[PDB]
Amino acid sequence: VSQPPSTQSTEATSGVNSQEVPALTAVETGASGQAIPSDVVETRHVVNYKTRSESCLESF
Amino acid sequence: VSQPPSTQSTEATSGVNSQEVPALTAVETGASGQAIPSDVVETRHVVNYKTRSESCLESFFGRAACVTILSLTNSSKSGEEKKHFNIWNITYTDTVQLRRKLEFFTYSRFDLEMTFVFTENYPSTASGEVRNQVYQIMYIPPGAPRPSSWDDYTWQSSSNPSIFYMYGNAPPRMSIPYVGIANAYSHFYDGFARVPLEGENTDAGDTFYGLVSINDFGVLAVRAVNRSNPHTIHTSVRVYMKPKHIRCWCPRPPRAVLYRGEGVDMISSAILPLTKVDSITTF
Amino acid sequence: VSQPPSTQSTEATSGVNSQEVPALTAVETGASGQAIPSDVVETRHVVNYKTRSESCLESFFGRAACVTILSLTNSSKSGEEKKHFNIWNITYTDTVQLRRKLEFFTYSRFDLEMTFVFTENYPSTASGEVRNQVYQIMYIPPGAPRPSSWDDYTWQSSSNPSIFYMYGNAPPRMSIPYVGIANAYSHFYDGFARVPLEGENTDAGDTFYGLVSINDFGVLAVRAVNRSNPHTIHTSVRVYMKPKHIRCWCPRPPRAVLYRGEGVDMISSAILPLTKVDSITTF
Amino acid sequence: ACGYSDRVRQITLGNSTITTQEAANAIVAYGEWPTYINDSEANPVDAPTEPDVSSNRFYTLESVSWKTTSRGWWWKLPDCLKDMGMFGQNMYYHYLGRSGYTIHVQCNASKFHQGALGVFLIPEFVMACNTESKTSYVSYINANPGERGGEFTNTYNPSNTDASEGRKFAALDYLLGSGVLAGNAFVYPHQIINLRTNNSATIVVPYVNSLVIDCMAKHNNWGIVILPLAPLAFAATSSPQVPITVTIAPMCTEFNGLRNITVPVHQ
Amino acid sequence: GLPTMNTPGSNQFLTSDDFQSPCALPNFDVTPPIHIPGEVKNMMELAEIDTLIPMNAVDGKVNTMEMYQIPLNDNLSKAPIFCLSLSPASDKRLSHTMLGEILNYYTHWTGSIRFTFLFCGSMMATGKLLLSYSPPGAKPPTNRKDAMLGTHIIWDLGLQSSCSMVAPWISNTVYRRCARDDFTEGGFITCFYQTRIVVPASTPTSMFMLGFVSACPDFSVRLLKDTPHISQSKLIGRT
Amino acid sequence: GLPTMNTPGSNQFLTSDDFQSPCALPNFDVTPPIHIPGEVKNMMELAEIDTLIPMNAVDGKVNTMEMYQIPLNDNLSKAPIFCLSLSPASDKRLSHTMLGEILNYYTHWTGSIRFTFLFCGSMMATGKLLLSYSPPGAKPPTNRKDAMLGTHIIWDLGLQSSCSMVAPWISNTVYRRCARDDFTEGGFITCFYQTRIVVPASTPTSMFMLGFVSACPDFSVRLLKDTPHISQSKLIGRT
Amino acid sequence: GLPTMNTPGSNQFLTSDDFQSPCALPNFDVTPPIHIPGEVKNMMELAEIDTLIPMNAVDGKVNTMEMYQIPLNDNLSKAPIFCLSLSPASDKRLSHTMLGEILNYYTHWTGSIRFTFLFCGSMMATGKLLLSYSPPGAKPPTNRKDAMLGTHIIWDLGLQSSCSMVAPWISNTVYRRCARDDFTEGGFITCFYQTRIVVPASTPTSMFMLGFVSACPDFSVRLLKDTPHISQSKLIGRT
Amino acid sequence: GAQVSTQKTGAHENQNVAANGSTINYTTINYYKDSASNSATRQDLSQDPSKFTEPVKDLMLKTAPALN
Amino acid sequence: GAQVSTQKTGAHENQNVAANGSTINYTTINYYKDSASNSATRQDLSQDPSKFTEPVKDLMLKTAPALN
Amino acid sequence: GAQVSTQKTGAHENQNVAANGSTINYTTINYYKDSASNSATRQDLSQDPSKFTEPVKDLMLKTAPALN
Ligand SMILES: CCCCCCCCCCCCCC(=O)O
Ligand SMILES: CCCCCCCCCCCCCC(=O)O
Ligand SMILES: *C(=O)CCCCCCCCCCCCC
C-alpha cells in the first residue's frame, strides 16, 4: 500500500515587512515566475490531497 | 465470518403501575414518537433475525434504471443527414422513476454504471436490405467541440471516451467515477448561477435560477458509423444509470405530484396527490 | 474424502423355528409392514453399494421444467399494439409436469432458477424483412404499476428486476431467493383469504377459497423493445423453473386424475385413473 | 437539579440574549453543531475572516401576524439577514461565505388560545415558479425577499401571460410550493409551537452544502418555513390575531475572497 | 486459449446484476470527500421519522392542509373520532405518509407501527380519548365497547401534549404484502371519547389533534419494487 | 483479455445443468426458517410407506373403493385368490400405488418388495392362506401345488391381523426397467387357501382382506424420467 | 470447458479501456534506450512554464506579435492598463497560452495562477503600477479605488525587472469548469497606475510590459476531453 | 476461497468406495454475493423413513407381537 | 489478491446465524485499476435513526416527562 | 505470478489516504510473452518542473534579488 504524491498544500502564513521580496524577480534570466499565494498574501493552512494523476503522459 | 445486525427483538414484559409513562410525550420538541410494544402492552420474548439488509442505500439504488431513449435514423434521403446522429444531454430528469428516488436526498455521492441497449427497426415500407450496424457513443464533456454532421472530425475521440457497439452483441456498459466538481452531487439548488448587480433588469435571474442553471455533465453524441444504405433504417438507443458506491445526505419528502420540467415546478393540471375518502370514519 | 450411505445390505441368514414371528404384524397400528428377506427366507450375504442418491429431493427437483408459454406479436397493424406485449401471472399451474411433482408435498421451501427460451416466426405471408429483436422481461411484484401500452413509463424498471435478451444469444437465466412471506411455500390451503362475518351472503367465500385466493407472486411483463416494422413478427417465450436448495414437508398422494383449474377440482369427464383388468386372477 | 426545567432556557451570542419560560427543549439539526472549516477540509487558500461577535449574534426580523386566514410564511438564510448589521457587511464584501445559525421563533398567546405552528428548517428550499409558460422562472429580486420573506397561499394560479407574475414562487402550502405533501415536512429539522404547550421554538443548524464554503449572494442554504398545522383560534372573536417573531443568529461564520462590496439588483 | 464454455444467461443484461465494468475515465482524481451533516445509511431510518397522516381527507378537505387536522369538540358523542385500516402502503390516507411512500418502493413489510397524536386544543381544555388497534378477524369496531376489547390506551390530555399508541406487529404471516390484500389483513385503528373534551368559560369549543405515523425499530421492508405513486407521459422522441 | 477458447456445448441450455446464475433480487433478507413437522429428504422414504393395492380392479369394481377389497369366503376352492405380476411401474394395478407412482418417475429399480395383507373378516373367522412369489422363467403358478414350490409363506389368520410376504430381490440384471419389458421379468405373486376360511354360527360367510405394497430398505430407483400417468391438453396461447 | 458466462460490455470497444492485446511482432528486439535531455512526465509540468499573454489582442493588433505588447506611457490616467477575466481556457486571450492550451484538453481545473509582468521600458523610466485579482461576486473593478479593495500588489519598477501577482485559488467549488460558465466564475485581474511612469530628458515616453501566465504547484487539471482549438476538414475517402 | 469435493463415482471409476485418487475431485468457487445463485446443494443421503412408516407411540420390534 | 466473504443466507441455508459452512463463501477479485469499476460496496447495516427521530439538544428518556 | 496493487480511490472510498482495506486491490497477471502487450504502465506522479521553469545555472532563491 502506498500514497500518490499530492499537489503542494498551502501552509498558513501572515504579514511581513522584510527585505525578502518573493514578489519581485527578473524573468530575463529565462526562469519562470515562482511566487505562490504564501509569498504574496496571508494564507490559511490547507491540506491538499488532489493529484496530477491524470496529466501523466500515460493517462494523457 | 460475521453476523448481520438484526432489527430489534422483542423482550418479554408484563404489567406496570408506575409513574413512568413511556406512552406520553411532547412531539413539539421536534422529536418523533419513541414508544414500542413493550412500553404499551404485555409482550412475549421474540428473537428477531430479520435485517434491513435491503433498505441499505446501496441496495435501494442498486438497479440499472432507464434514464432516456434516444432516436436516430441512418437514411439516404435528402434531409436525413442530421438524422444520422443525435446529441443527448446527460441527466436523469428525462424520466421519473430513478429521478424520484435520488430526489429523496438533497445531496448524494457515487460512481456510475452506464449500460446501453440498442433496438433498430424499419420505418416505412423500405423493408429492404441493410448490412449490420456499428454504433458509436461519444462522451463530450463541457467545453469539447460538438459534431456538426454525422461525420465531421469530432468522432476521432482522441481524448473523449467513446464506445463502439456492434449491434447484436451484449449491451455495452461502462463505469464512471464520481466526477462532480463539488464534494458531493447537489440534487437541489436554492440559488442562481451568478449574482445580478445593481444596474440590471428588474427581472434578472429568472433565466439562471435552479440547480439546472449550474449543473452540467456534458453530452452523449450517438450515431451509426455505417454509411447511408438504399433503405432507411431507424435505431433507438436506451440509456441506463445505476448509481453505485453511493451515500446521500439530508432526507426530503418524496415527489408527490407530477414533474414539470427539470425543476420543482408543478402543473395546475395535476396537483391532487391524495384521494377523497368517504368519511373520516370510513375504514 | 467420504463414502455415500448405501442401501441396506443383505446379511446371510438361515432356518428358524422360534416364537419370534417377524412375518406377522398388525397394520391397524398405522405402522407399515417392516419384514425384509432375512425375516422370511434363507438369505446369502450381499454387500450393497447402491445409493438412493438420485431420489434426493434436490435431484428429484433438479431440472429446468417448462412452466408456461407466452406469446406476443410485434405488428404495425391497427389493433396490434396490445399484441406488442404480454403479462404472465407467476405460477407453476400453467402446466402439469412440474406441478404434479411439487404437489407431492404439502409445503416446500427453495430458491428458484428462471430460464427463458425465445422463438420467433412469421405469421402470414408477411415474410419480409425485420431487424433483430431485443426483448425485455420485467418482474412486476404485487403492488407495482403495470404497463398500459407496450411502451408506457413502466418499462423504466428503476426498481423492478428486468432482463434484456438479444435474440440469438444464450437463453437468459437468473436466480431468485425463497421469497415466500411465510416460513415455507404452501402448496395447498384449506382456507379462505378472509373471514366472512355474521351479516353477509349465505354464499360468501365461494370467491375467496383455496390456496389460489391467498397466494400472489406478481407478474412477468414481457415485450419486444424494437418498434413496429413493415412485416408483422410473432414471438413465443417459454418460462422454465427449477426449484433449487429445496426441502419439503408432509407427503401426500400424487395427482391421480386430470387437473381442472388451479385448485384440486376434478372434471367428471376424466376421473377414472385405473384400468379394468380381465380378472382378479389375471397375471 | 435545583429545578432546571426543560421549559425554561437562555441563549447568548455576541451581545444578544434570548430567554423563554415555556420552550420545548431545542433541537440540533441532524445532530451536528456549527463548526469551522478544518485545515483538511479547506478549499479557499486565503486567510479567512471570522467576525465572531461582530456578526455572530441575534438579529430580529420584523414580526408577522398569525390570522385565522394566515396560510404560512417562509424566509431564506443567509438572505433574510443580508441587511442585518455587521453580518451583512461581511457577507457582501466577500465572494465566499460560510455559516450556521440558531433559529428562535417566538409566539406567545394565552391559556385560552389554540394553534400550532410547524417550524421547519429546510436545506436547499427550492420552490416552483408561478407560470406554466416557463420553468425555473424566478427573478433574483423575488427569490430573495429578505427580512420580509414570503408567505404561503392555498391556491395555484400561474400567469402564463403576465411575465411579471411568473417570475415568483408559487408558495402552495399543502405542497411546500415544492410538489411534496407538507405532511412529511417533518423529515427536516423542526419543532412545533403548540400554543397550549410552548411559545418558543429553538433550532440550531449547522452549515449544509455539497461544498465547504459557498457564495452566499447566489445561494441560500437554508429556508425557514412556518405552517399553521393547527389554525389559530380564540373563544372571543372570529378574527383573532397574534404576532409571530423570528430571531436568527449566525454562528461560526467565516469568509474568503475579499474585494469591493457586492450590491445586487433592487427596485 | 483457456478452454471455456458459455452458460445460460450468457450476454444478457439483468438490471439487478452487480458486476465489474471497465472505467471510461481512467485515473480520475476524484474530489476529496468531506463531512456533510445528516448522512443516511438506510431507508428504514427515514421510516422511523414521525410523519403527518391525512386522517381527514374527506371531500372539501382532501388535498389541502385541512386534511391533516382531525376534528375534536366539546359535545359528547359515542362515535368514532376516526377510523383507519392498517395497510401502510394501501390505504389512500396512509399510502402518502413518509412511512407509506417508502413501504411503496418495497413488496413486503414487517414490524410495529407507532401512531402518535398531538392534541392542539387550548391549554384550558381537558379530556380523555381512547386509541385502539384491533387485529383483523372480527366485526370492525364501530362503537367503543368493541374497540376497548382489543389493544388500546386511554390517553389523558394534559401537560404532555403528545401520546403514542402502538400497533404491536401481530400477524399470521411473517411479512405482509404492501399491495392491498385480504390474506395480509392489517386490522383496525379507531378512536373514541373516554369521557369528553371539556372546556370552560370563553374557551374554543372545537379544535383538532394531529396524527403521526412512524415505524418501530423492529420494522423492516423487503423486495424492491417500483412505486405506483408517480406517473410519466410516454416520452416524445424525435423519430 | 485472458486468452480463452469456447468449446462444444458453449451457449446451450441443458435442463439438467447445475450452474451458478446471478440473483435478480440481491440482498433479499430471506424469511427466517422454522421447524416444520414431517420433513422429507428422499422419495424412497415415501416408497417404503405401505400403500393399498387395487388387487380387484375388475369390471364393475375398478375406479371405486371396492377395487381395494379382495374377496374371501367360507367355501373351499383350489383357485387363486388373486394373481399379480411383479412389475411395480407397469401392471395396471400396481402402477398406481404410492410405490408405483414413484417408480414411474424413474427408469430403473432394484430392491425387495413388501406385500402386506390385512384380513378384515370377523374376529370369529379362522383360516390359513398361502402367499407366494415365484421368480420368472417357468409356467405361471395357476394351482397351489406349483406356487408352493417357490418362495412362499403360510399365513395363519389370528390375533395378529396383518401378515407380510416379501419378494426377495431375485433378478439377473442388477436393475429392472420401469417400463414393461420381457428381459426384465418380475415374477408371479399369487395366493391360495392352505385350508379354508371357517366361520361358525351366525358369522358373515364372506369378507375381504386388504393388500398393501411397500419397498424394503435395500430398494433404490434411478434415472429420472417424466411420468406417463398424467396428461395435459396442449395449452391455448393467444396468437 | 470452464463454465463461463458473458456479461454486459462483452465485445465492446471502449477507447479508454486498458487491456492486454497480443503482439503482432513477437520477440522484437527493441532499440536500446538512451538518455535524452529534457524528458517530461506530466502535462502539468508544462503548465508551470511561464508563457506570454496576448493581453492586447485588439483590432489591428490581434494575430500579430504586437498583441503580446502591453501599452504604457508617460501620461497619468486613472484608467485600467488592462482588464482580464479569470477563465484560463475560456477567455479569447488566455485560451491560447501554454497554460490555456493544456487546460483545454481537460474539463476541470484547480489551483493558483501566477501572473508575472516584465516592464520593458528604458532603464531611466520609473513608476509604480498596481496589479489586482478580485474574486467574483461584485461590480467588476473599473477604477483603482475598487481594485485596491481586493487581492493586489503595488509593483515598483526598478532593477528587478519582473514582478508576479498571484491569483490565490479562491473558489466555492473545489474544481472549476474549463468551458465558460457562470457558476464557475473566475474573477477580475486588472491593472492601474499607483503613481505614473515617469521619464526624464530624452527618454522614450511610451513603452510596454510583457504579461506571462503560469500555474502554481497546487494546480491540477482533470477529465481528459478533446480540444476545440483545432479543426479538420472531413477527410476525402476514395469511395 | 475455492472448495474441493468428491465427485460422483462414474463408469470406469474407483471401486464404489469413492476413495481412490484425487482424480475424483471437483472444484467449486461461488461467484455471487447471494446464496440463491449457488449450484444444487450437496447431495444429502440422510433419511428417517420412520416418521412415515412407523410413527407409532410405543415402539414395537419385528420379532414381537405387534399387538401385545 | 482474491478476497473471500460471506454470502447472503439463502433458502435452505444456515440458520440465519450465517455461521455454518464455507459453502456460504463467495470470492472476489477486482480486475480494474479504477475503484469505480468495482461491484456494489459491501452491505452496511449500520444506522443512526436518531439524527432524524431525536435531534433534540437535552436528551429525554422514554420513561420520563418529555417536558419537565 | 499475479501481482496485486492499489486501485485508484473512487467515489465512496478510503479517505484519500488510499490506505483503507484490501477492497482497493486489483490483480494483474500478464498473459503475453511480449511486454508491449501489457496494460498501461503504472501511474507515475514524479516530476521535475524545474528543467523547464528554472534551468538557470546559478541558483536563485525566491526571497533573494533575482539579479544580484
Ligand atoms: C462513454 C459514456 C460517458 C458517460 C459520462 C457520464 C457523466 C456522468 C455524470 C453524472 C450523471 C449523474 C449525476 C447526477 O445527475 O446526479
Ligand atoms: C426477472 C424475473 C423475476 C421472476 C420472479 C419470480 C418470483 C418467484 C415466485 C416463486 C414462484 C414459485 C413458488 C411456488 O409457486 O411454489
Ligand atoms: C479462493 O477463492 C482462492 C482461489 C482463487 C482462485 C481464482 C478463481 C477465479 C476468480 C473467482 C471469481 C472472482 C470474481 C471477482
Ligand SMILES: *C(=O)CCCCCCCCCCCCC
Ligand atoms: C490474488 O489475486 C491471487 C489469486 C490469483 C488467482 C487468479 C485469478 C484470475 C486472474 C485475475 C485477473 C488478472 C488480470 C490481468
Ligand SMILES: *C(=O)CCCCCCCCCCCCC
Ligand atoms: C502466478 O501466475 C500464479 C497464479 C496463477 C493463477 C492462474 C491465473 C490464470 C491463468 C493465467 C494465464 C495462463 C496462460 C497460459
Ligand SMILES: [Ca+2]
Ligand atoms: Ca500536499
Ligand SMILES: [Ca+2]
Ligand atoms: Ca435482534
Ligand SMILES: [Ca+2]
Ligand atoms: Ca449397505
